[PDB]
Enzyme design. Structure first.
Site, PDB file in Angstrom:
ATOM      1  CD  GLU A  35      -3.066  -0.809  -0.099  1.00  0.00           C
ATOM      2  OE1 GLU A  35      -3.070   0.235  -0.768  1.00  0.00           O
ATOM      3  OE2 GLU A  35      -3.821  -1.756  -0.352  1.00  0.00           O
ATOM      4  CG  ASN A  46      -8.285   6.671  -5.407  1.00  0.00           C
ATOM      5  OD1 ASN A  46      -7.433   5.963  -5.956  1.00  0.00           O
ATOM      6  ND2 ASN A  46      -8.434   6.717  -4.090  1.00  0.00           N
ATOM      7  CG  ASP A  49     -13.813   7.118  -6.027  1.00  0.00           C
ATOM      8  OD1 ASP A  49     -12.689   7.638  -5.880  1.00  0.00           O
ATOM      9  OD2 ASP A  49     -14.189   6.282  -5.184  1.00  0.00           O
ATOM     10  CB  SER A  51     -12.311   8.608  -2.560  1.00  0.00           C
ATOM     11  OG  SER A  51     -11.718   7.586  -3.347  1.00  0.00           O
ATOM     12  CG  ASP A  53      -6.721   5.251  -1.488  1.00  0.00           C
ATOM     13  OD1 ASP A  53      -7.823   4.943  -1.009  1.00  0.00           O
ATOM     14  OD2 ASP A  53      -6.486   4.974  -2.686  1.00  0.00           O
ATOM     15  CG  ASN A  60     -11.395   5.390  -0.269  1.00  0.00           C
ATOM     16  OD1 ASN A  60     -12.578   5.707  -0.246  1.00  0.00           O
ATOM     17  ND2 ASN A  60     -10.554   5.779  -1.236  1.00  0.00           N
TER      18      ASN A  60
END
Ligand code: NA
Length: 130
Positions: A35, A46, A49, A51, A53, A60
């Site tokens: 990750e 992201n 959409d 969002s 991380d 998220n």
């Protein structure tokens, strides 16, 4: 902060992650490695959409933390996303434990399916004294 491998492994053990909801320490380590490369200040926007991380486990903002700017979002860990970018990982760990309390468990992270599931994950804890 960028953790060294065994430093992180010992930290996660003390925070009670080994076997949490059935998930071995070596799997949490494989997760953090893929990750964020053990980096607490990692962020990934992201665009698809809207969002973001956050942190070592790339948690998220749509479901888990509040950053204000994600549409239709909830905040299941009851944290500002900012708490997930600290050098102290206590809050990120509490939130990761919340994520795996849902039915999917560790499968919630696709990188785990790709890089960790059904692999020999012993390498991530080997020689760390855990
Ligand atoms: Na949120």
């Amino acid at each position: 902060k960028v953790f060294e491998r065994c430093e992180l492994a010992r930290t996660l053990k003390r925070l009670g992650m080994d076997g949490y909801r059935g998930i071995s320490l070596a799997n949490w380590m494989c997760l953090a490695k893929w990750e964020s490369g053990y980096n607490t200040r990692a962020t990934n926007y992201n665009a698809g959409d809207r969002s973001t991380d956050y942190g070592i486990f790339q948690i998220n903002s749509r479901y888990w933390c509040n950053d204000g700017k994600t549409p239709g979002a909830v905040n299941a860990c009851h944290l500002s996303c900012s708490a997930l970018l600290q050098d102290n990982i206590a809050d990120a760990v509490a939130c990761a434990k919340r994520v795996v309390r849902d039915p999917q468990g560790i499968r919630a992270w696709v990188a785990w399916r790709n890089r960790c599931q059904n692999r020999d994950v012993r390498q991530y804890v080997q020689g760390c004294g855990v």
